[PDB]
Amino acid sequence: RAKAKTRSSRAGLQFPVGRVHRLLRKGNYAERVGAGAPVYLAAVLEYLTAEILELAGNAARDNKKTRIIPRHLQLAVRNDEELNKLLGRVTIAQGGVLPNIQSVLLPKKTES
Amino acid sequence: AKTRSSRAGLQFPVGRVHRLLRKGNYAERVGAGAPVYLAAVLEYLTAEILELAGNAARDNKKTRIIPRHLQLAVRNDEELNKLLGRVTIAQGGVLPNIQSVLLPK
Amino acid sequence: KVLRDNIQGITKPAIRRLARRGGVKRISGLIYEETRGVLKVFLENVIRDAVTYTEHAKRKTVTAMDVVYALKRQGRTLYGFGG
Amino acid sequence: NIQGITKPAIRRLARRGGVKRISGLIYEETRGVLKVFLENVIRDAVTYTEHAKRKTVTAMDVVYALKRQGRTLYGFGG
Amino acid sequence: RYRPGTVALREIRRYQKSTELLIRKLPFQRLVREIAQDFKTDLRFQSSAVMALQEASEAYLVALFEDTNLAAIHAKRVTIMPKDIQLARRIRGER
Amino acid sequence: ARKSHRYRPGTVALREIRRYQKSTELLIRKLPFQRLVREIAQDFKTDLRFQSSAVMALQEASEAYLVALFEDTNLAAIHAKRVTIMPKDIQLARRIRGER
Amino acid sequence: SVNYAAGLSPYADKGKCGLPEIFDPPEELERKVWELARLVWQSSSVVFHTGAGISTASGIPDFRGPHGVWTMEERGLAPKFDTTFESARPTQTHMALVQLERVGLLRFLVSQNVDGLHVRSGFPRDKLAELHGNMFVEECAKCKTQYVRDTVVGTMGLKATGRLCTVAKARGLRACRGELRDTILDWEDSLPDRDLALADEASRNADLSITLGTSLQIRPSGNLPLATKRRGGRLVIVNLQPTKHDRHADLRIHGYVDEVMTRLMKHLGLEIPAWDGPRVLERALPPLP
Amino acid sequence: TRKESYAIYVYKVLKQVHPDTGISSKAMSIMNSFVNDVFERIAGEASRLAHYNKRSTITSREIQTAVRLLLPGELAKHAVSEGTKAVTKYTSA
Amino acid sequence: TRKESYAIYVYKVLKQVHPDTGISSKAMSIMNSFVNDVFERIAGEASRLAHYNKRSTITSREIQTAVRLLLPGELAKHAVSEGTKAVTKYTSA
DNA sequence: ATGTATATATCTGACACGTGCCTGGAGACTAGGGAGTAATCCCCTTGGCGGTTAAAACGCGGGGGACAGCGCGTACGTGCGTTTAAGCGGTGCTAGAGCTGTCTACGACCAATTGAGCGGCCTCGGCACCGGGATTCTCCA
DNA sequence: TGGAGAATCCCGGTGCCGAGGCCGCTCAATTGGTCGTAGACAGCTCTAGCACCGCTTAAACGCACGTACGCGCTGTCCCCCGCGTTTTAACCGCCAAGGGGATTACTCCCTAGTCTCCAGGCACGTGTCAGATATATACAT
Ligand SMILES: *C1O[C@@H]2[C@H](O)[C@@H](COP(=O)(O)OP(=O)(O)OC[C@H]3O[C@@H](n4cnc5c(N)ncnc54)[C@H](O)[C@@H]3O)O[C@@H]2S1
Ligand SMILES: [Zn+2]
Known part of the structure; x- marks a missing residue:
């Protein structure tokens, strides 16, 4: 046989295409699975992961760290409307909540 | 008798349930006892909802069942209401009720 | 052919009837525009999903089953039109 | 055993939520709501565990229970 | 003449007993076609499709109005205002 | 660095809000909550063993649920022209959410 | 020239309004700028510190001096202004520092002013630290x-x-x-992360840092030249008013920053460019011979 | 092509429970949709249960667990009892 | 025991987008669970789309439609763009 | 002379990197059936017109409550000191989670058979619709 | 307390489109038999849940005091609501065109299934790096 160049390398991805193909086949989603379905699904998953990770890295920069923690993922998700809608029902563990304080609860200044 | 539905004490189609399970892309194999169970559960639930709807129809001086009767039956029973919380019955209307303060005093 | 500002078709008496069915005894004047906007948003979501289903199916007509599937996706399953 | 959820714990949860003042009668209602939520989640998880013929409630059983109730939980695998 | 408020309850009772479609069908169909024009051009809605859309919209609006009325009554009022609708939609995760 | 008696009732609460909304640690004592989970699961199946990760997952879920419920309760209380959340606020929030 | 006195916050614990504008004799000032020039011409790592005394020449008033905004707001009520940030004409010292960076003598710059005239003067943004x-x-x-x-x-x-x-x-x-x-x-409020980090690195590496037009009363910004002399290094504090670290100062001037910088350049034989509009530049310009 | 519906069996159940009552076409369609939806729910939950435990067959146990997980208390108990009765009467003969 | 996870690929993507930034084990677990959840959702929607059109296969068209249905806003647009680019590059090879 | 702040050193923990081991993925191959693709048919959607007419629109008056303000009681916030049980780090034990090994009961599949549920057929009635007679909160007095 | 009414519950007549039954049959459900394997059952082990204790000590609990808030009462005014007349367009009934959904052949390209080969991916080890804490020194009061 010739050199075994993985499907991901040909596609240009970073996520596995063979693994996602096997998950689709063994996942019992259809009697047969197309040859382009794993590539498309892997590309979509990689894009979503890259988006979350980029926003989490920005959050970690803002929080003055060099290592992503769950709090950074929660901040990256809840601060982006699209991801918040997509991840509305998730509860990221050890993520806390956004710093929201209602205006009415704030005190009234201009004293003295 | 010959038909699986007949051998069990059911009225729902066991053969159709088995065919749907096999063709539905649920598992590679489907046990021979699963269709009987699923058909029994479907028959029981249909019996319950139809019994409540028929009771509503009888209380509504109607000899038949209309979507409104089904809606009243579903909403007036807590267990089914929790079961069917995210469903809307076309032409079923809304359960009659008014707030406790808007009434005349 | 290009329909315009048909949201006004939802008249004040219609929203009032909907409110009365919902158990409301008194309705503010500002309620009507808000209700029209909410209805528009809901319809946009449902119609977007239905049109996506239709376009995937290679069809050019929005079958009732498309609307039923769209409602089912958004957790508002509808009984009485198939599915 | 329910009283293990102390008043300071509920006050801290409210402060995390954003609450500024808490009526004295909130605490019992919060305990009841917590009890109902835990009852539902634990019932689903224990049903999952019993199905798999296990005497131990694995974490993945709790994750699946939460997913069933529309409360998918990340960070515990699955 | 009737003192104000008494016939509001009569309309509530009448429109809760009945089960017809409150919104007029033709304006709703025009609204649906206008909405659909945004996504894809020259669709062809089946009559059953627009009936399903109308049933779904009416059920959604009735439920939203019931929640809005509950919110208004909680606020020590009898009249529903836009803020009650905003509260009801926010507590339900919408918007 | 930055750029540079009795407190009025209301400022220490704001300090607590600022403190607890910027942290991530669970806000319930682990041992009492674990005992509560065991007691609740007792009514279903006896001699039921819990993984530590299972109890932690339950605690995280319950903490998130209660924080969200309290957020909605505070919004409801503010809607009613108030600052102190009352049980009626919690009941209204749950009723609108669909859980009640 | 909007004032950062009420804009910051009502709380203002300056406690400094009696500021005798001590001026140095011309001969003593000449000798002091001479010794400063002798030291700086051979010192390699030189980082500057520009405060709100440089831009006073431009026209925007200072904060602590007799004409300082906080001083007037404390003693009565009479805030006087002449120019605006949009019309703010850069002071000769800004282009002098630009030239110092161009020739490479100026290792770094850590300013605390707010008008950004250094940025508008074409100073490479990668070399500045606008702390405030x-x-x-x-x-x-x-x-x-x-x-x-x-x-x-x-x-x-x-x-x-x-x-x-x-x-x-x-x-x-x-x-x-x-x-x-x-x-x-x-x-x-917190300082800007790695801008402050770069300022700390530069000041620590600075074997000779001179701080201009600032009273050094303020947080870190006035403390960087404290660290510039710890672990070695000399500190030159060129300011009219008595700074908060004159006791620690290794040098002192009582004169106009424009005049002393001009004398420094004349002794060094250095010239000065002549302002611009918002000719902003970021990448560090190549060192000149 | 001819379509498939549960109309006949819903009719039979209605006659068994209400021997003197009819049903409208709309109500029959609603019942058909309800039966389809409940069947889909139970089957999907059974499939997930089988997949979680690495099984490959949806046996009666998977269906029982799914119907216990979906329906509320009394409804689930009655449904599971009737399913067990049906399976017992089927396998026995 | 042989456990499967997307950890290596997530780490590779992170190092591709953030050259100097680590990721905690807990954060990695959250990301792996997120990938699993999104994969399951998209695959299930694709399966239902295939079943509705009486098709017995899943193709890039079904995945694209599922992505359109699930992801909101610009997220869906860019996800479809990336998937289309990936599929066209793969087919070209 | 003492106290506090900052700097440096050391220790611990976590993780990125390195390594061997193995099994799941890639290349080459064949067979058959899922679904493209074209042709044809006709069901249903769009579109129009016209008449009656049910409901929307507009105006007008009044009266109900939304909302603001003011005053009183007390419930919660904040602080302090005393209690107590959570937290952590030890051991010590063992229920059972996970893996392996073996074998058989069972589901898939196939051939052949037949029967029951569906499309189109007709017959009969439930209640929407109409006429009037008697009844219940509203409003007024 | 009482008295007139708009709207509502209810009795009698009844005929049409929808519910209900008939029936031929054709594809799907049923019976019998073959074969491979997915899972039933039994064993082994050793991971980790569980139980208990002592010391630290962070947090929970009880009380005291005061003020900030909740709650209630009262007074505009203004903003809905109810009613009556105009009018605006829905609704229905019918008819035409034709697009597009639905079914049917031909087929051909794509994917399931196999087999062989082997690098990518995982378990484990490790060492290295980073962060935090503690101690010591220097400076200031
Ligand atoms: C937030 O932002 C503000 C900004 O960052 C600085 C401003 O104050 P500093 O620059 O730290 O000190 P400053 O008040 O500027 O002290 C400098 C003193 O110098 C006198 N002065 C005016 N003109 C001068 C020339 N040409 N040469 C020497 N000295 C000169 C001023 O009168 C002043 O006393 O911190 C705040 S807080
Ligand atoms: Zn940006």
Whole structure:
């Protein structure tokens, strides 16, 4: 046989295409699975992961760290409307909540 | 008798349930006892909802069942209401009720 | 052919009837525009999903089953039109 | 055993939520709501565990229970 | 003449007993076609499709109005205002 | 660095809000909550063993649920022209959410 | 020339309004600038510190001096202004420092002023540390992307200005929509992360740092030249008013910063460019012989 | 092509429970949709249960667990009892 | 025991987008669970789309439609763009 | 002379990197059936017109409550000191979770058979619709 | 307390489109038999849940005091609501065109299934790096 160049390398991805193909086949989603379905699904998953990770890295920069923690993922998700809608029902563990304080609860200044 | 539905004490189609399970892309194999169970559960639930709807129809001086009767039956029973919380019955209307303060005093 | 500002078709008496069915005894004047906007948003979501289903199916007509599937996706399953 | 959820714990949860003042009668209602939520989640998880013929409630059983109730939980695998 | 408020309850009772479609069908169909024009051009809605859309919209609006009325009554009022609708939609995760 | 008696009732609460909304640690004592989970699961199946990760997952879920419920309760209380959340606020929030 | 006195916060514990404007004799000033020039000409790592005394020559008043805004706001009520940030004419010292960076003698610069005249003077942004901030700079809250504007953003207290981030990223990751907040620190607010880090690194590496036009009363900004002399190094404090660390000062001047810098350049044989508009430049210009 | 519906069996059940009552076409369609939806729910939950435990067959146990997980208390108990009765009467003969 | 996870690929993507930034084990677990959840959702929607059109296969068209249905806003647009680019590059090879 | 702050050193923890081991993925191959693709048919959607007419629109008056303000009681916030049980780090034990090994009961599949549920057929009635007679909160007095 | 009414519950007549039954049959459900394997059952082990204790000590609990808030009462005014007349367009009934959905052949390209080969991916080890804490020294009061 010739050199075994993985499907991901040909596609240009970073996520596995063979693994996602096997998950689709063994996942019992259809009697047969197309040859382009794993590539498309892997590309979509990689894009979503890259988006979350980029926003989490920005959050970690803002929080003055060099290592992503769950709090950074929660901040990256809840601060982006699209991801918040997509991840509305998730509860990221050890993520806390956004710093929201209602205006009415704030005190009234201009004293003295 | 010959038909699986007949051998069990059911009225729902066991053969159709088995065919749907096999063709539905649920598992590679489907046990021979699963269709009987699923058909029994479907028959029981249909019996319950139809019994409540028929009771509503009888209380509504109607000899038949209309979507409104089904809606009243579903909403007036807590267990089914929790079961069917995210469903809307076309032409079923809304359960009659008014707030406790808007009434005349 | 290009329909315009048909949201006004939802008249004040219609929203009032909907409110009365919902158990409301008194309705503010500002309620009507808000209700029209909410209805528009809901319809946009449902119609977007239905049109996506239709376009995937290679069809050019929005079958009732498309609307039923769209409602089912958004957790508002509808009984009485198939599915 | 329910009283293990102390008043300071509920006050801290409210402060995390954003609450500024808490009526004295909130605490019992919060305990009841917590009890109902835990009852539902634990019932689903224990049903999952019993199905798999296990005497131990694995974490993945709790994750699946939460997913069933529309409360998918990340960070515990699955 | 009737003192104000008494016939509001009569309309509530009448429109809760009945089960017809409150919104007029033709304006709703025009609204649906206008909405659909945004996504894809020259669709062809089946009559059953627009009936399903109308049933779904009416059920959604009735439920939203019931929640809005509950919110208004909680606020020590009898009249529903836009803020009650905003509260009801926010507590339900919408918007 | 930055750029540079009795407190009025209301400022220490704001300090607590600022403190607890910027942290991530669970806000319930682990041992009492674990005992509560065991007691609740007792009514279903006896001699039921819990993984530590299972109890932690339950605690995280319950903490998130209660924080969200309290957020909605505070919004409801503010809607009613108030600052102190009352049980009626919690009941209204749950009723609108669909859980009640 | 809007004042950062009420804009920051009502709380202002300056406690400094009697400031005798001591001036040095011309001969003693000449000798002191001479010794400063002798030291600086051979010192390699030289980092500067410009405060709100440089831009007084431009026209925007200082803060602590007799004409300082806080001084007038404390003793009665008479805030006088003449110019505006948009019309702010750069002082000769700004271009002098630009030339110092051009020839490479100026290792770094850590300013604390707010007009951003150094940025508008063409000083490489990678070499500056606007600790307190800059009006002509608005940074994206989300991705910490910084935008140089030719018009003042017009906001105080690190608040949203009304414009959304307009930069994009690789791989198809969506273009950002950050709030684009402003850069000026209110009292009890954090400093800008790695700008402060770079300032600390430069001052520690600085074997000779001179601090100009600042009273050094303020947080860190006045403490960097303390660290410039710890672990070795000499500190030259060129300021009219008695600074908070004159006891620790290894040198002192009582004269106009413009005059002393001009004498320093004349002794060094160095010339000065002649201002510009908002000719902003970021990348460090190559060193000159 | 001819379509498939549960109309006949819903009719039979209605006659068994209400021997003197009819049903409208709309109500029959609603009942058909309800039966389809409940069947889909139970089957999907059974499939997930089988997949979680690495099984490959949806046996009666998977269906029982799914119907216990979906329906509320009394409804689930009655449904599971009737399913067990049906399976017992089927396998026995 | 042989456990499967997307950890290596997530780490590779992170190092591709953030050259100097680590990721905690807990954060990695959250990301792996997120990938699993999104994969399951998209695959299930694709399966239902295939079943509705009486098709017995899943193709890039079904995945694209599922992505359109699930992801909101610009997220869906860019996800479809990336998937289309990936599929066209793969087919070209 | 003492106290506090900062700097440096050391220790611990976590993780990125390195390594061997193995099994799941890639290349080459064949067979058959799922679904493209074209042709044809006709069901249903769009579109129009016209008449009656049910409901929307507009105006007008009044009266109900939304909302603001003011005053009183007390319930919660904040602080302090005393209690107590959570937290952590030890051991010590063992229920059972996970893996392996073996074998058989069972589901898939196939051939052949037949029967029951569906499309189109007709017949009969439930209640929407109409006429009037008697009844219940509203409003007024 | 009482008295007139708009709207509502209810009795009698009844005929049409929808519910209900008939029936031929054709594809799907049923019976019998073959074969491979997915899972039933039994064993082994050793991971980790569980139980208990002592010391630290962070947090929970009880009380005291005061003020900030909730709650209630009262007074505009203004903003809905109810009613009556105009009018605006829905609704229905019918008819035409034709697009597009639905079914049917031909087929051909794509994917399931196999087999062989082997690098990518995981388990484990490790060492290295980073962060946090503690101690010591220097400076200031
Ligand atoms: C937040 O932002 C503000 C900003 O960052 C600085 C402003 O104060 P400093 O620059 O730290 O000190 P400053 O008040 O400027 O002290 C300098 C003194 O110098 C006198 N002065 C005016 N003109 C001068 C020339 N040409 N040469 C020498 N000295 C000169 C001023 O009168 C002043 O006393 O911190 C705040 S807080
Ligand atoms: Zn940005």
